Amino acid sequence: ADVPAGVQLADKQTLVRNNGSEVQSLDPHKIEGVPESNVSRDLFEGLLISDVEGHPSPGVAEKWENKDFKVWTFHLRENAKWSDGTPVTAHDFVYSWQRLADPNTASPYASYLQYGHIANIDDIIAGKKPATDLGVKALDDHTFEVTLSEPVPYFYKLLVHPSVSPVPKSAVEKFGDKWTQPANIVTNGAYKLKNWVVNERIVLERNPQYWDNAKTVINQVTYLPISSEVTDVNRYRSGEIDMTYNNMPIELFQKLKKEIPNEVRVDPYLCTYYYEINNQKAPFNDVRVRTALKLALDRDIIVNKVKNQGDLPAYSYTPPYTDGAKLVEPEWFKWSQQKRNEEAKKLLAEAGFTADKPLTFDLLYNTSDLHKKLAIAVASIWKKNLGVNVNLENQEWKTFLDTRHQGTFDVARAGWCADYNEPTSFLNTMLSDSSNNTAHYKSPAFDKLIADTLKVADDTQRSELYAKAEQQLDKDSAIVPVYYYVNARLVKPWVGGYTGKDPLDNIYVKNLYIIKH
Numbered sequence: 385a386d387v388p389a390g391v392q393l394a395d396k397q398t399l400v401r402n403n404g405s406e407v408q409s410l411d412p413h414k415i416e417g418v419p420e421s422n423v424s425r426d427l428f429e430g431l432l433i434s435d436v437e438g439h440p441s442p443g444v445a446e447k448w449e450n451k452d453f454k455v456w457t458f459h460l461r462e463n464a465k466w467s468d469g470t471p472v473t474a475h476d477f478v479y480s481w482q483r484l485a486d487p488n489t490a491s492p493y494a495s496y497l498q499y500g501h502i503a504n505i506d507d508i509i510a511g512k513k514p515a516t517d518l519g520v521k522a523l524d525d526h527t528f529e530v531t532l533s534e535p536v537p538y539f540y541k542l543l544v545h546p547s548v549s550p551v552p553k554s555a556v557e558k559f560g561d562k563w564t565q566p567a568n569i570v571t572n573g574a575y576k577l578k579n580w581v582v583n584e585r586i587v588l589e590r591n592p593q594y595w596d597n598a599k600t601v602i603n604q605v606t607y608l609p610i611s612s613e614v615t616d617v618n619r620y621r622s623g624e625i626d627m628t629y630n631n632m633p634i635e636l637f638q639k640l641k642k643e644i645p646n647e648v649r650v651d652p653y654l655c656t657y658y659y660e661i662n663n664q665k666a667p668f669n670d671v672r673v674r675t676a677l678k679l680a681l682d683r684d685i686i687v688n689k690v691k692n693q694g695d696l697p698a699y700s701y702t703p704p705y706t707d708g709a710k711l712v713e714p715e716w717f718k719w720s721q722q723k724r725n726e727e728a729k730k731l732l733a734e735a736g737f738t739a740d741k742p743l744t745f746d747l748l749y750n751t752s753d754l755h756k757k758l759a760i761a762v763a764s765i766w767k768k769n770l771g772v773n774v775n776l777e778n779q780e781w782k783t784f785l786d787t788r789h790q791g792t793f794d795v796a797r798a799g800w801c802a803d804y805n806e807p808t809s810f811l812n813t814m815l816s817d818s819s820n821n822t823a824h825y826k827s828p829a830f831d832k833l834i835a836d837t838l839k840v841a842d843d844t845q846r847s848e849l850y851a852k853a854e855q856q857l858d859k860d861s862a863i864v865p866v867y868y869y870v871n872a873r874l875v876k877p878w879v880g881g882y883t884g885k886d887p888l889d890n891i892y893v894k895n896l897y898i899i900k901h
Contacts, residue, residue, distance in 0.1 A: 385599060385600065385601040385602070385880075385881050385894060385895050385896055385897045386436075386599070386881075386895075387601065387880070387897050388880075391880060391897075391899055392899065392900040393601070393897060393898065393899065393900060394878065394898040394899060394900045394901065395900075396898070397601050397602050397603045397604075397897065397898050398602065398603060398604045398605070398606075398898070399602050399604070399605045399606070399626050399627070399879070399893060399896060399898065400605075400606045400608065400624060400625050400626050400627075401422070401605060401606070401607055401608070401625070401626065401627045401629075401893075402607075402608045402610050402616040402619070402620070402625050402627070402628050402629040403419045403422055403423065403586070403607040403608060403609060403610075403629055404418070404419045404609070404610070404611060404629035404631060404781070405419050405609050405611050405750065405751075405780065405781035405782075406419075406582055406583050406609040406780070406781065406782065407419050407420045407423055407586070407609075407782075408420050408781070408782045408785065409564065410423060410424070410427065410564040410569070410577065410580070411551065411563070411564055412424055412428050412480075412546045412547060412549045412551055413480075413483055413484050413489050413491045413493070413547065413551065414489075414491060414492075415492070415493075415546055415547075416492040416493055416785065416820065417781070417785065418801060418889075419607075419609075419629075419781065420546070421545075421546050421890075422607065422891070423586055423588070423607055424546035424549065425546070425573065425890060425891065425892050426573050426574060426575040426588050426605065426892065426893050426894070427569075427571040427572075427573045427575055427576070427577065427588065428546065428549035428550065428551070428571060428572060428573050429443045429444055429464075429472075429549060429550075429572050429573045429574075429594075430443050430444065430543055430544065430545070430546075430548050430549040430550065431443050431444055431445040431448070431458050431460075431477070431528070431540075431543045431548070432445060432448075432540060432543040432544050433544055433890075433892065434544050434886060434888065434890035434892070436881060436883055436885075436886075436892075436895050437883055437885040437886055438805075438885060438886025438887060438888050438890055440540055440541050440543070440544055442461075443543075443544070444458075444460050444461065444464045444472050444477075444550070444572070445458035445459060445460055445461070445528070446459055446460070446461040447459045448540065450539070450540075452535055453532075453535035453536055453537045453539065454531065454532045454533075454534065454535050454536075455529065455530070455531050455532070456529070456530040456531075456532070456539060456540070457523075457527065457528075457529050457530075458474075458477075458527070458528040458529070458530070459526060459527060460472065460473070460474055460525075460526040460527065460528060461526075461595055462526060463595045464572065464595050465572070465593040465594075465595065466552060466570050466571065466572045466593065467569075467570055467571045467572065467576045467591045467593050467594075468570050468593075469593055471525070472550060472572050473522065473525040473526065474522030474523070474524065474525060474526060474527055474528035474529075475522045475525065476550040476551075476552070476553070477520065477522070477528045477550055478520050478521060478522050478528070479551075479553045480548075480549070480550045480551050480553075481497065481502070481518060481520050481548065482515040482516060482518050482520070483515070483551065483556070484496070484497060484547055484548070485497050485502075485505055485508045485509065485515045485518050486508070486515040487508075487509060487511055491547065491819065492785075492789065492819055492820060493545075493546075493547035493819060493820065494509055494819040495509070495812070495815075495817070495818045495819040495820060496542065496545060496547045496548065496803075497518070498812070498815075498817075498818070499542065499808060499809075499812045500530075500532065500536060500539050500542050501532045501533045501534050501536055501838065502518060502519045502520065502530060502531070502532060502533075503518070503519025503531045503532060503533050504517045504518055504519055504533075505518065505519075509817075509819075519531035519532065519533070534838045534839070535838065535841065536838060538804065538806045541804040541805065541806060542803065542804045544803075544804070544890060545803045545804070549572075550572060552570040554570075555568055555569065555570045564577070564580075565580070566578060566579060566580055571591060572591075572594070573591065573594065573892075573894075574590065574591055574594045574596070574597070574600050574892065574893065574894035575588035575589060575590060575591050575594075575605065575893065575894070576588065576589055576590070576591040578604070583609055584608075584609070585606050585607065585608055585609070586606065586607040586608075586609075587604060587605075587606045587607075588604065588605050588606075588607070588893070589603065589604050590602070590603050590604070594894075596894070599894070600894045601894075601896065601897040601898075602893050602894070602896055602897065602898070605893045608625070610629070611750070611751045611752050611780075611781070612633075612752070612753050613628075613629070613631045613632055613633035613752065613753045613754050614633040614635055614636060614753050616628045616629055616631075616633075617632075617633055617636055617640065617874065620874050620876075626875070626876045626878075626879050626898075627873065627874070627875050627876070627879060627882070628873050628874045628875075629873065630653075630871050630872060630873035630889065631752060631754050632693055632754065632872045632873070633753045633754060634690065634691060634753065634754060634757045635753065637692075637693055637872075638692070640874070644874070646877065647874045647875060647876065647877065648872065648874060649871070649872065649873055649874070649875050649882070649884050650693075650694055650870050650871070650872045651870065651871045651884035651885070651887075652705065652870065652871065652887045653801070653868075653869045653870055653871035653887055653889060654703050654705070654706055654801060654802040654805060654887045654888060655703070655799055655800065655801035655802070655868070655869040655871075656698055656700075656701055656702070656703055656799065656800055656810070656865060656866075656867075656868055656869070657695070657698070657797075657798070657799050657866045657867050657868075657869055658698065658701065658798050658799070658800075658863045658864055658865045658866050659677070659681070659747070659762070659795050659796070659797060659798065659863065659864035659866065660788065660795065660796045660797075660798035660822060660823050660863055660864075661674050661677065661794075661795050661823065661861075661862070661863060661864065662791055662793050662794060662795070662796075662823070662824055663823055663824050663825045663826070663862060664791055664824040664826075665791070665793075665794065665824075667735070667743070668745075668794065668795070670735055671860055671861055672731040672732065672734055672735040673731075673732065673735050673743065674860070674861035674862070674864075675727075675728070675731055675861040676727075676728035676729070676731040676732040676735070676770060677728075677766065677770070677772070677795070677861075677864050678861045678863075678864045678865070679716060679724040679725070679727055679728040679731075680724065680725055680728035680729075680765070680766055680769040680770040680772075681762060681765060681766065681769075681864055681866065682721050682724075682765050682769065683697035683698065683866060683867065684697060684721065685761070685765060686758065686761060686762065686765070686866060686867065687866075687867045690757065690758065690761045691754075691758065691867070693870060693872055694870040694872065695867035695868060695869055695870055696867060696868045696870075697717075697866075697867055698865035698866055698867045698868050699713055699714055699716075699717040699858075699865055700854045700857075700858065700865060701800070701810050701811070701814070701854065701857055701862075701863060701865065702807045702810040702811060702850065702854055703802075703810075703868045704868070705868075705887075706802060706805060706806065706807050706809075706810065707805045707806060708806050708807050708843070708846065708847055708850065709807050709847070709850060709851075710847045710848070710850075710851055711850075711851050711854055712851050712854075712855060714855070714858055721769075725769045725770070728769065728770050729770060729771070732770060732771075732772070737771075739771065742771055742772060742773055743770075743771075743772040743773070744772070744773040744774070744775070745772070745773075745774060745775070745794040745795060746774070746775045746776075746777050746793065746794040746795065747759050747762070747763060747774040747775065747776050747777070747794070747795050747796070747797070748777050748778075748779060748784065748787060748788075748793050748794070748795070748796040748797065749776065749777070749778055749779075749784075749796070749797035750778065750779060750780065750781045750784040750797065751778045751779065751780055751781070752778075755778075755797045756776070756778065758797070758866075759774075759776050759797060760776065762774075763776060774795075784796075785822075788822040789822055791822075791824045795864075796822075798822070798863070799869070800813060801869075801888070801889075802887075802888055803888075804888075805887065805888060807847075807850040808834065808837065808850070811834055811850060811853050811854075812834065814827075814830060814857060814862060815830070815831050815834060816828070816830075816831050823862050823863055825857075825860070825862040827856060827857075827860060827862075829856055830853055830856045830857060830860075833849050833852050833853040833856060834849070834853055836849055837849045837850065871884065871887075871889050876901075877899075877901065878898055878899040878900070878901040879896060879898065879899075880896060880897045880898070880899050881895045881896040881897050882896060
């Protein structure tokens with residue numbers, strides 16, 4: 385943390401943050417969501433980290449070079465250590481990225497190594513080559529060298545993500561799935577795990593071995609698992625919570641902006657809220673059905689009437705303000721909702737559905753005030769505009785993600801937030817073989833457009849290809865875009881160091897501080 389000259393620090397430097405749900409895991413190779421990543425950034429530190437404004441910056445690597453954007457050499461600081469005092473070395477990175485690539489680990493982020501095009505990853509994922517063939521090596525204890533199969537000018541931007549953080553081989557090996565328990569875990573971020581009580585709290589304490597420990601200010605941070613946005617706001621206003629999760633309740637938000645304007649933080653956020661259709665399951669394998677659902681949803685009602693928190697109606701997957709996005713707004717987005725409804729009814733009438741045999745399906749969402757209220761509204765809109773019937777089902781976060789990976793669903797509420805600010809952070813998740821493809825969408829045409837982006841060495845050609853890839857997704861109605869999120873949350877006046885400038889919202893508690901109050 386960089387405390388401004390003249391700010392008076394509180395005697396007690398403790399923080400309580402709501403984290404939206406119980407995490408999937410604390411193992412960097414078994415996680416894929418925002419709540420998980422929030423805790424992961426405090427515990428595990430990779431090659432680079434984001435600074436307080438989100439810029440990729442030195443993490444365990446103090447400096448790095450690239451040869452033709454294909455060979456990346458990371459010089460690791462000599463004093464990087466784990467919480468047990470042992471050094472973090474390039475060998476830790478070699479073992480960790482191999483473990484991520486290994487199919488036996490079954491990471492939801494195995495494909496992150498395909499996104500960076502680390503040599504031999506496709507064969508490793510397919511079981512054709514062992515994980516030790518991965519294009520990574522330790523040239524010495526403090527030098528990690530990464531070899532890609534094609535030039536990737538933005539490669540270093542990927543390296544702030546939890547999937548590429550190091551994990552301690554000796555703890556993993558000795559304790560298996562219990563390596564993350566407080567008595568067994570070993571960490572290299574600013575914090576260490578003190579307590580983990582499922583569905584109650586996660587408490588982290590300062591890690592004195594952290595290389596940058598002298599600049600850490602907060603001594604203890606607690607992460608809560610509260611999925612009710614209403615309850616989160618209530619416990620923030622009672623004094624318990626210092627920073628809510630960034631999902632805001634429809635019941636209270638309008639009141640909140642009028643009651644505590646200065647605590648309501650609203651900033652840009654590279655995330656898209658959408659309804660994920662399971663493209664492999666009939667009748668959702670029919671584009672007419674998917675297009676009807678996409679067109680009949682009334683974004684103006686959802687975004688400005690039912691939610692009204694500053695979100696922008698969406699017509700694509702990749703947010704248009706992603707660095708490198710130059711998207712073409714489709715003609716259906718400019719039409720009237722009436723015109724979109726007739727088209728939708730027409731397509732559904734064409735797909736075999738009638739009043740006697742209507743379209744009825746499930747709408748899965750993770751337990752939340754916000755998502756339930758949006759799903760109820762979407763169900764009403766779809767019923768009125770298209771005559772379809774939907775059965776709402778809530779599931780807790782960890783189970784909800786598993787269900788979508790399992791492809792035991794019809795339509796699911798969904799949200800993707802960028803992992804690095806470049807359109808492929810979104811677009812690579814729709815590749816046929818991506819480990820993050822929960823839409824279960826497989827288009828050889830889409831795959832080809834993305835494959836072509838690194839075969840050109842021109843930003844303009846790349847952007848035009850990303851635009852076309854979005855048009856292909858849209859043409860196939862792989863998803864139902866709803867809105868581009870804003871990052872809205874409450875932060876107490878005494879919480880310093882949170883700028884809101886990072887559109888990825890990669891917060892590190894080591895950067896915050898409590899002002900005397």
